[PDB]
Amino acid sequence: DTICIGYHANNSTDTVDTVLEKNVTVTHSVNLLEDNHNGKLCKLNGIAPLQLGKCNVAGWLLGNPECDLLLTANSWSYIIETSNSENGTCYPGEFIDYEELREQLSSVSSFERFEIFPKASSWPNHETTKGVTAACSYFGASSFYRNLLWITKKGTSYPKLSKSYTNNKGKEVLVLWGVHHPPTTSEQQTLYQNTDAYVSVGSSKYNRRFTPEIAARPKVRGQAGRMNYYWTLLDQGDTITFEATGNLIAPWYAFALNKGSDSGIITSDAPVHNCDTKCQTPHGAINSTLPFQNVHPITIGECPKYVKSTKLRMATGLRNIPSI
Amino acid sequence: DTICIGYHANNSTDTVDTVLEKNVTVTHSVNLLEDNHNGKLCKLNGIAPLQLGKCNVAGWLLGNPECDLLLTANSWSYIIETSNSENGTCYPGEFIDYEELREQLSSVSSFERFEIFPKASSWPNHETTKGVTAACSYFGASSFYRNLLWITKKGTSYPKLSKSYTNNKGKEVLVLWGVHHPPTTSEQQTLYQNTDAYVSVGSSKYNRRFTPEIAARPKVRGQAGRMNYYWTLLDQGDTITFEATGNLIAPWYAFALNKGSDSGIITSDAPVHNCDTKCQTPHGAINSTLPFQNVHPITIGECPKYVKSTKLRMATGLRNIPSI
Amino acid sequence: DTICIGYHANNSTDTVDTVLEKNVTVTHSVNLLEDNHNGKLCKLNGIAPLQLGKCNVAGWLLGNPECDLLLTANSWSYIIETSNSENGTCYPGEFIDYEELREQLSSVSSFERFEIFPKASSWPNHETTKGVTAACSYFGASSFYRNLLWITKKGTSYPKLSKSYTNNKGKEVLVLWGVHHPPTTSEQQTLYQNTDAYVSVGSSKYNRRFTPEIAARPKVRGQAGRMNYYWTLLDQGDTITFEATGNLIAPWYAFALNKGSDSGIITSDAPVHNCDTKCQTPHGAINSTLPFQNVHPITIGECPKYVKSTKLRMATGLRNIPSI
Amino acid sequence: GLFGAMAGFIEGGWTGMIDGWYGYHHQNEQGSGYAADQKSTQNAIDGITNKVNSIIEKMNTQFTAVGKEFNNLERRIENLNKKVDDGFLDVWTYNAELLVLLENERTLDFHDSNVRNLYEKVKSQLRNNAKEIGNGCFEFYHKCDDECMESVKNGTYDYP
Amino acid sequence: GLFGAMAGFIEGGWTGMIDGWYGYHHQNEQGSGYAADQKSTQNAIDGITNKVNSIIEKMNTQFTAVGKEFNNLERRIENLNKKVDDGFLDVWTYNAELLVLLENERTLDFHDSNVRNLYEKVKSQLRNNAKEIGNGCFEFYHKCDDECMESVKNGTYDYP
Amino acid sequence: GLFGAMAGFIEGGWTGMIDGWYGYHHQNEQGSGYAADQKSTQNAIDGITNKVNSIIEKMNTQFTAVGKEFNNLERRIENLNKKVDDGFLDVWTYNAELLVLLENERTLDFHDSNVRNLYEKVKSQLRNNAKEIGNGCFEFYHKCDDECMESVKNGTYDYP
Ligand SMILES: CC(=O)N[C@H]1[C@H]([C@H](O)[C@H](O)CO)O[C@@](O[C@H]2[C@@H](O)[C@@H](CO)O[C@@H](O[C@H]3[C@H](O)[C@@H](O)[C@@H](O)O[C@@H]3CO)[C@@H]2O)(C(=O)O)C[C@@H]1O
Ligand SMILES: CC(=O)N[C@H]1[C@H]([C@H](O)[C@H](O)CO)O[C@@](O[C@H]2[C@@H](O)[C@@H](CO)O[C@@H](O[C@H]3[C@H](O)[C@@H](O)[C@@H](O)O[C@@H]3CO)[C@@H]2O)(C(=O)O)C[C@@H]1O
Ligand SMILES: CC(=O)N[C@H]1[C@H]([C@H](O)[C@H](O)CO)O[C@@](O[C@H]2[C@@H](O)[C@@H](CO)O[C@@H](O[C@H]3[C@H](O)[C@@H](O)[C@@H](O)O[C@@H]3CO)[C@@H]2O)(C(=O)O)C[C@@H]1O
Ligand SMILES: *[C@@H]1O[C@H](CO)[C@@H](O[C@H]2O[C@H](CO)[C@@H](O)[C@H](O)[C@H]2NC(C)=O)[C@H](O)[C@H]1NC(C)=O
Ligand SMILES: *[C@@H]1O[C@H](CO)[C@@H](O[C@H]2O[C@H](CO)[C@@H](O)[C@H](O)[C@H]2NC(C)=O)[C@H](O)[C@H]1NC(C)=O
Ligand SMILES: *[C@@H]1O[C@H](CO)[C@@H](O[C@H]2O[C@H](CO)[C@@H](O)[C@H](O)[C@H]2NC(C)=O)[C@H](O)[C@H]1NC(C)=O
Ligand SMILES: *[C@@H]1O[C@H](CO)[C@@H](O)[C@H](O)[C@H]1NC(C)=O
Ligand SMILES: *[C@@H]1O[C@H](CO)[C@@H](O)[C@H](O)[C@H]1NC(C)=O
Ligand SMILES: *[C@@H]1O[C@H](CO)[C@@H](O)[C@H](O)[C@H]1NC(C)=O
Ligand SMILES: *[C@@H]1O[C@H](CO)[C@@H](O)[C@H](O)[C@H]1NC(C)=O
Ligand SMILES: *[C@@H]1O[C@H](CO)[C@@H](O)[C@H](O)[C@H]1NC(C)=O
Ligand SMILES: *[C@@H]1O[C@H](CO)[C@@H](O)[C@H](O)[C@H]1NC(C)=O
Secondary structure, eight states: OEEEEEEBOOSOOOEEOOSSOSSEEBSSEEEOEEOOOOSSOOOSSSOOOEEEETBOHHHHHHTOTTOGGGTTOOOOSSEEEOTTOOBSOSSOOOBTTHHHHHHHTSOOSEEEEEESSOSSSSSOSSBOSOOOEEEEEETTEEEOOSSEEEOBOBTTBOOOEEEEEEOOSSSOEEEEEEEEEOSSTTHHHHHHSOTTOOEEEEBTTBOOEEOOOOOOOOOSSSOSOEEEEEEEEEOTTOEEEEEESSOEEEEOEEEEEEOOSOOOEEEOOSOOOSOOOSEEOSSOEEOSSSSEEOSOSOOEESOOEEOSOSOOEEEOSOBOOOOO | OEEEEEEEOOSOOOEEOOSSOSSEEBSSEEEOEEOOOOSSOOOSSSOOOEEEETBOHHHHHHTOTTOGGGTTOOOOSSEEEOTTOOBSOSSOOOBTTHHHHHHHTSOOSEEEEEESSOSSSSSOSSBOSOOOEEEEEETTEEEOOSSEEEOBOBTTBOOOEEEEEEOOSSSOEEEEEEEEEOSSTTHHHHHHSOTTOOEEEEBTTBOOEEOOOOOOOOOSSSOSOEEEEEEEEEOTTOEEEEEESSOEEEEOEEEEEEOOSOOOEEEOOSOOOSOOOSEEOSSOEEOSSSSEEOSOSOOEESOOEEOSOSOOEEEOSOBOOOOO | OEEEEEEBOOSOOOEEOOSSOSSEEBSSEEEOEEOOOOSSOOOSSSOOOEEEETBOHHHHHHTOTTOGGGTTOOOOSSEEEOTTOOBSOSSOOOBTTHHHHHHHTSOOSEEEEEESSOSSSSSOSSBOSOOOEEEEEETTEEEOOSSEEEOBOBTTBOOOEEEEEEOOSSSOEEEEEEEEEOSSTTHHHHHHSOTTOOEEEEBTTBOOEEOOOOOOOOOSSSOSOEEEEEEEEEOTTOEEEEEESSOEEEEOEEEEEEOOSOOOEEEOOSOOOSOOOSEEOSSOEEOSSSSEEOSOSOOEESOOEEOSOSOOEEEOSOBOOOOO | OOSSTBTTTBOOOBTTOOSOSEEEEEEETTEEEEEEOHHHHHHHHHHHHHHHHHHHHTOOOOOEEOOOOOOTTOHHHHHHHHHHHHHHHHHHHHHHHHHHHHHHHHHHHHHHHHHHHHHHHHHHHHTTSEEEETTTEEEESSOOOHHHHHHHHTTOOOOO | OOSSTBTTTBOOEETTOOSOSEEEEEEETTEEEEEEOHHHHHHHHHHHHHHHHHHHHTOOOOOEEOOOOOOTTOHHHHHHHHHHHHHHHHHHHHHHHHHHHHHHHHHHHHHHHHHHHHHHHHHHHHTTSEEEETTTEEEESSOOOHHHHHHHHTTOOOOO | OOSSTBTTTBOOOBTTOOSOSEEEEEEETTEEEEEEOHHHHHHHHHHHHHHHHHHHHTOOOOOEEOOOOOOTTOHHHHHHHHHHHHHHHHHHHHHHHHHHHHHHHHHHHHHHHHHHHHHHHHHHHHTTSEEEETTTEEEESSOOOHHHHHHHHTTOOOOO
16 A cells, blocks of 8 residues: 655646756746737727828828828827828928927827818918919829918019917817928019018917028929928917918918827838727737737837747746656 | 744734735734835935925026015025926016026026126116016016016117126026017017117027017017027136127126036925935935835935835745734 | 765855855855956957047048048947047037937948049139138148138129039938138128128938028137038938038038948047957946946947946855865 | 755656646555645645736836837937837846746746645654655555545544 | 745744744743744844845935926927836836745745754754654653753754 | 755865765775765756856847937936936846845755755665764665665665
């Protein structure tokens, strides 16, 4: 008669590493490194993202003629740009504080596009029907952004215009605008007459005044002229006043939005399907259960610390030593 | 006859957590998480802070009429703003590089306020007695900052003024000034005559030239005009030169200070009592003995790493298993 | 007859610290803290650095007359400035985005200095032989930077100049230039005639227009006038256009470089010998074998995490208890 | 391992014991078989389970977007942001890596320790009523039917 | 625990031993009482004391002001600064949390180990001159007056 | 230490054993001398060697330039950059410092454990054929020539 005390063993082949030994076969292990993803762009916390496709953020906000499908944008928890998002500022120029804007609009609760300064009778005694270019061509034809209006000299006189807007939308209002810069002071006059024009933008929190920066410069996608795009968030109850004697690319449509918390912009070509998630990446949705992730350094949400590891397997059972 | 070897036990109820078991009663433990504070704003390393009260940093430096009690400021290791610190730039405008200044003045060894450009005879043939506004009203009456002087056109002529100052204080000198921006080019003339005025500030390390940025803008706390406030640290032996044909809000009083190391600005309504400390927070003084703190993410001094923990109790004694 | 089982002991005096005991003598230990260096400035990954000596980066790029030895610069993995690198912008002024440039040029694969705008016949009907100053004196004589050309009014007329350059070098081109700012509008005319001159720089990615910022300012190392230095990286195939009616300090020599990855700038007086290394510091080369280093917080390359430790000795053998 | 039992004086695992981690294997005139020691097994599971939760549950994380976007004149802060990202990810990589190594060592030792304690719990009861065969077994100096085998399993072995 | 003594083969604590962590309790014809083993207790205190200092003393900190202040056009770096603050505070939270868990395990094991060593130090001297009653006690096969009880306490027990 | 062997029941080191970490020392009518137990020594070396590599190999690092350069109007981010540098270097300082302390404890315990296991491996074979003298030695109740001494060294000691 005998009795032996011993330990378990099985067909397991999982191996873990220890301080003293590499690859030790164990009866039971658990993985702490999430390295799989659904290769899809999901909803972050139950709120679909915003797809721009061929358009990038600048093209979407300005109203590039190739982003007509984006004129209905609504809600979104994060923005998606594609390797094909090259349609932005069709008319050459610098988008002032662009990154900063991209960052601030990464997440939006409510977002409504309204006509702040109606093209139809808003700038009488001013030409508002020639503001079109070949750079921003829509279906072969010459066109222009859909949220800005290219006001140009009437007849042969460009009278000083003035227009204000008060935010009564009960929420921040994104007001975009631009200032055109002719290549020559010869054009500055054939377009805006006044060869000393200025564009001023006033608000209880704004005052930057502009003047045309004429300069011989290379032609970009056609035009040698340039357009700097500006923006500002108009607080509830505040009034933004525009007055200019030329070079003003007036706001036509503005957006009344509601920012709560900020997220970011994912750039990927993965399909956008209806799935949920707490942590999202460019390659797809990642699980938020494990303490570590090695799928992508760049993520958005509540994510598992990114590590350069390939294996973080933790033992639960004991050494596996079978054989009868 | 017998002898047993055993271990200690007592009335202790302290519990600690271990890798394998939650809440284990121990005979003796030690806390590593500091989570208490004296609910008071102390002295950081034996040097009282600076209380602004109703005034914020901008109001204190510019000389807002509501900060007359702050005209004697001296030394301080960190600055205190209250939930009632709303008295700053009474006259609407942008305080250029404000954050940056707040940061740089967080700590000061010596700090003396002197008259750099005496109001009395410094700008003869110039009106220096009308520089007053309703926005900066002192006791019902119209007033103005106490460290700046609002120079305005004399009679109907605003001759080009020029004035220099050399830092012979044997230490950095903070020189504050402003540039007024009328809402209309009509006012630019009824105040400074020259409707093409400019304000230039020269130093061996400065040259930014200014021009009035007229623009129709909303009225803020009264005035539709604006005043941008500027500043610079004048190095020993260097000379700062001001010359202007209008729109200059000249420095009246400047500060001769001595920065050594930088700290920060605490914003809290906790009482300021005479106590010392190495690490201070918005809720009160924290102890610097333990490796961790959970009182407040924002601290100033040599502090215990902020953690989201509620309990970091370390065992010293053994498992407590009493009962006779 | 007897047999005892025991453990090793020797003459070792190495001591390590443990959770429970300080200084425990061990038979064998290993150091994990690298705290030695060759007190020399080596090659980072087999590519010598760039020595500026008396010159700093600004003096090297602009062409300060004291950096003539640096006109052949080639390749380099990191830049070396000395406690004697004080020869930069001999002519007083602000080097716009200087830090940013220093950062971007920290590492360069190929770097060729070419004549972009030949002094000899490039600005006919313009004075290109007086652009010299006492601040930038070369061997007692008055001189000027070697990569910029000080164009000044011809006779008594300063006609509007215009000149473009297209990057056909097949790689980024660093184009440096400056804008002179007279102290008085009286000099603005005796030098450039037009007392309303402007300097515009155009590119498919640039448009900043300049005007002279006249202002009474202190004299620095002689001159009271100032020169702001600018730069830009011209992309392959792009064209940079300069046109100006005065105040232009035209590019004379530009650089055609090849940036791949970025490194930094070491400032030290240690000798530069021909040695290699993965991690370099101001005091000398450091080893990259150990996980920790305490030689210098500031390093360049693949370095061992900097720690405030003085001793990180790890036990390998057992407690050492000799004596027979 | 650290405690000698696993791959030690009890050099092999029991593929036949399929209802627990640590247990017995008796052999008497009536039959033979394995039986997992339920108490030491459950306790071991609870502990490991708790250890795994800790390593997971203790990982705090807030909503965050790592990416940044800086223009060509913001190389300095773009690199600063890079230093931060590389920086933390160099910390979590060294920590995860080592936390597992060290905890894996601890876990295996824990099992080894549990076996040695079990073996010893029994070696205590039998005393002289059995001879120790250095393979983790005990041969009784008497008959031990299933009741007897049971008693030692549930630690209630009579007069020793 | 890991070494079997606490809440193991010596299942209870001695509320009556109030002058040390580990000790004895004799019982003979002259009387009874507890006595803390002074050497193993002091050494245990010194060690734990040293362990606590380490965990504290090893925390380096320089004067610092965490707060920053960025205007409405500095969201990017304000967030960068946020990533840094959340970042480090996610590191210290996971570290403190685990450092305690793991060190608490170590400490308790250390005590358990000290008891087992003590018990064994004695079990060594007595040998056959006493029978082991699996509760951490030894019953002498002879008389053991206070001198005798003493000798074993200060490890100088005669002929065994 | 944790396992009683080093500076414990085997209070001293053998300056005379120069071919291993753990071993024996026999004494019989033919002669005497030391002999390192090769298997437990090699295994101990392999493990420690592996432990040292881990602590080193697991340190990931990318090419980096810590320095930054910010002008007098960039104090905010210069300080942010400072917080980052001080920040990480406060993490690596506390980690290196403690990693060594804790791992040094582990290593010494490991050695101590290896000795106790060795001592026990032998104490197992000899059984009653030798008396234990609490100094880590065994005195045979019989003659043990060099063959015999050998057999116990390579764990093949006959009838016990
Ligand atoms: C003013 C307006 O409403 N938009 C016109 C724009 C703007 O004038 C311009 O962007 C201001 O910066 O210009 C458009 O394109 C024409 C314009 O670029 C002019 C240059 O001043 O050149 C015209 O093409 C020339 C061509 O360069 C010659 O070599 C030759 O072929 O003649 C043609 C015709 O003039 C451009 O068509 C534009 O699309 O933006 C026309 C807009 O109506
Ligand atoms: C010039 C000076 O020393 N300070 C006066 C300032 C400045 O002119 C002004 O800030 C420049 O930007 O203006 C003060 O207030 C008066 C001013 O705002 C003017 C507008 O130009 O309006 C006056 O009130 C009007 C009111 O708007 C009318 O509806 C009607 O009631 O008449 C009154 C009187 O004109 C303001 O009083 C100021 O306080 O800053 C007056 C300073 O003396
Ligand atoms: C224009 C040119 O090519 N370079 C000259 C420069 C530039 O005019 C100047 O930098 C523009 O900002 O000036 C040089 O130095 C002379 C200049 O500073 C003038 C001031 O306008 O003063 C001259 O010295 C004066 C001195 O100040 C008087 O007190 C007295 O002694 O007479 C002398 C002679 O005028 C400077 O020599 C320069 O080196 O930069 C001369 C360049 O040729
Ligand atoms: C929409 O994006 C496309 C490119 O992504 C723009 O067209 C450009 O791309 C062509 C190749 O597809 C190139 O040949 C040209 O650079 C250019 N083509 C044209 C239209 O001239 C297109 O302009 C964008 N839409 C607009 C008008 O903004
Ligand atoms: C001092 O601060 C107070 C507010 O903190 C300023 O007064 C404002 O606050 C009132 C409520 O207390 C509001 O009704 C108004 O916005 C305004 N009141 C006035 C005086 O018009 C006050 O102006 C500040 N002092 C100054 C002049 O800068
Ligand atoms: C080269 O650097 C030296 C200083 O490092 C410049 O000379 C200055 O230094 C002198 C002391 O060596 C001081 O007395 C002066 O400030 C100044 N001396 C001169 C030349 O006036 C020198 O100018 C630099 N080279 C140039 C012309 O840029
Ligand atoms: C492993 O063993 C389990 C239990 O018998 C069984 O369910 C599984 O199919 C086996 N798989 C393999 C590797 O054969
Ligand atoms: C298992 O053995 C070694 C571990 O270092 C290695 O060669 C092999 O890739 C490992 N594979 C596994 C099981 O991950
Ligand atoms: C706990 O016991 C100690 C020692 O007897 C005594 O000082 C203290 O008052 C007791 N407190 C409690 C919980 O009764
Ligand atoms: C003690 O027991 C558990 C631990 O998880 C919990 O329910 C309770 O809140 C704990 N309280 C203590 C002693 O902190
Ligand atoms: C230490 O001992 C070794 C081995 O005998 C020997 O090589 C060395 O010279 C000795 N050094 C000292 C400290 O005497
Ligand atoms: C050794 O002993 C103590 C450790 O705290 C200290 O006084 C001494 O400086 C230490 N020196 C060594 C060996 O590093």
